[PDB]
């Protein structure tokens, strides 16, 4: 499962290595993988996921154009591996939005002034979902 | 704890609910609840408090001015309490950053050039980093 599900990523990046011992120290260091590991988790590799394909990939296609070919199928699998995670809420649910809230929002916008009305006076249903969300996280 | 977490909120809205029997169907739908209780819990309560806060509060006041004092002191206690809920990693993790990925992206940024270079470097690290990621939600 999992070993197989990265593979594709490590085949693409070793021919990318090829164009890039005293090492120094880590830029993605170990704090990373703990909050890899933590509550913000999802948060922590969301962000990075689209730090190396907005930010760094482009800029070292940039540097040496000769890497192109390689950095840009390395790109098309991690954007793959990130759509199989994220079809799952269970691996990267901040990536996911709420059809609930998608539904209320859409009620509520064609519900046009009518609509202010109704969510304003349902008020406290909604304090009573918020606590029965904090009442779930204490458990 | 909760119920008095929730008190100034409540309080507020028995001013407002009087500016606002045959209800017909709630806006704020029991599905809602049932995102609020699943993985995707913390995006649809960021996204409903965020919801009230910039499209609800702000066309009610505009649809009748005599609300204004009372929305404005609703408004206020729900910031508060997403401040309180948003400093507990625990409560809303997914309104929270981190501090890792800030720390590389800081670094990356100021070796400019060499940054890139130790990025695309290090992808196979990230690999390994997303693995234990994704072993730890499997778990």
Same mark, same amino acid.
């Given at each position: 499962?999992?070993?197989?599900?990265?593979?594709?990523?490590?085949?693409?990046?070793?021919?990318?290595?090829?164009?890039?011992?005293?090492?120094? #120290? @880590?830029?993605?260091?170990?704090?990373? $993988?703990?909050?890899?590991?933590?509550? &913000?988790? +999802?948060?922590?590799? %969301?962000?990075?996921?689209?730090?190396?394909?907005?930010?760094?990939?482009?800029?070292?296609?940039?540097?040496?154009?000769?890497?192109?070919?390689?950095?840009?199928?390395?790109?098309? #699998? @991690?954007?793959?591996?990130?759509?199989? $995670?994220?079809?799952?809420?269970?691996? &990267?649910? +901040?990536?996911?939005? %709420?059809?609930?809230?998608?539904?209320?929002?859409?009620?509520?916008?064609?519900?046009?002034?009518?609509?202010?009305?109704?969510?304003?006076?349902?008020?406290?249903?909604?304090?009573?979902?918020?606590?029965?969300?904090?009442?779930?996280?204490?458990?």
């Amino acid at each position: 499962n999992l070993p197989n599900m990265l593979r594709d990523l490590r085949d693409a990046f070793s021919r990318v290595k090829t164009f890039f011992d005293q090492l120094d #120290n @880590l830029l993605l260091k170990e704090s990373l $993988l703990e909050d890899f590991k933590g509550y &913000l988790g +999802c948060q922590a590799l %969301s962000e990075m996921i689209q730090f190396y394909l907005e930010e760094v990939m482009p800029q070292a296609e940039n540097q040496d154009p000769d890497i192109k070919a390689h950095v840009n199928s390395l790109g098309e #699998n @991690l954007k793959t591996l990130r759509l199989r $995670l994220r079809r799952c809420h269970r691996f &990267l649910p +901040c990536e996911n939005k %709420s059809k609930a809230v998608e539904q209320v929002k859409n009620a509520f916008n064609k519900l046009q002034e009518k609509g202010i009305y109704k969510a304003m006076s349902e008020f406290d249903i909604f304090i009573n979902y918020i606590e029965a969300y904090m009442t779930m996280k204490i458990r």
